[PDB]
Amino acid sequence: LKMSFDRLYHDIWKAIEELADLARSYVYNGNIQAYAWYLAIILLILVAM
């Protein structure tokens, strides 16, 4: 009974929920030049065809 599954699913959901706080701050910045760099990266992928 020391190895429950109630604990593991709360662990995996808290990991997804803190990844939700992770992707919020990384991709969605206040830096305008970050979005310019995102546009230049996807344009570079269009170069790569």
């Binding site: 230049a40 344009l43 570079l44 170069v47």
Partner: protein, 232 residues
Amino acid sequence: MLKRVLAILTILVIGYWLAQGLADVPFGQDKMVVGKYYLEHVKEETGAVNAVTAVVVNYRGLDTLGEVTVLFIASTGVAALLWKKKRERTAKTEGSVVLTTGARLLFPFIALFGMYIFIHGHLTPGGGFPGGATIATAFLLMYLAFTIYEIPHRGFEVTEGLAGMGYVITGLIGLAIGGYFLFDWIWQTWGWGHENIGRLFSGGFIPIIYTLIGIKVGTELSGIVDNMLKEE
């Protein structure tokens, strides 16, 4: 040094991609698949011997309309972004007197000439937009060489909307028959039409639409620099 050099690498591969993509033709002749119809049918289908004034107001007739929509939206956007009910000048810091008198006498010299540009879209190049922009330049010369020069706003943007309406009322009374149909040279609606072909009797329909659009874009940028030269 990381960001600048890495940007130069990616922008070099962008420019190489466009230059490899620019392998269509080395400035050759074979380009007009529909463009020959614009040239060979411009002297008898509109009246304006000008090429560009007949294609952008008659042929691509909903594109100077989107253009004046864009300029009017720039006016109302800057006016909505700057609104304080006070609207005073900066410090006005006079500076010279051969400048105020310099732009005084020169103000009708550009007012005569800017009108000359948009009335003549027949043998002269251009259209309504360079003449309207230099009418706005004359407004700017009187606006950047005096201590106030506030043209009265209540009674200023009225004629801008009136000139845009004057474009669209030629589309709406143009809807008396068909889509556009010029209302002016092909049917004796208000006056005559198609006298000869050169600067005799103002060609077809294209001059009066350029007077109206030149009046609209003439009061366009002058309003923008007006409500952007206003402090608290």
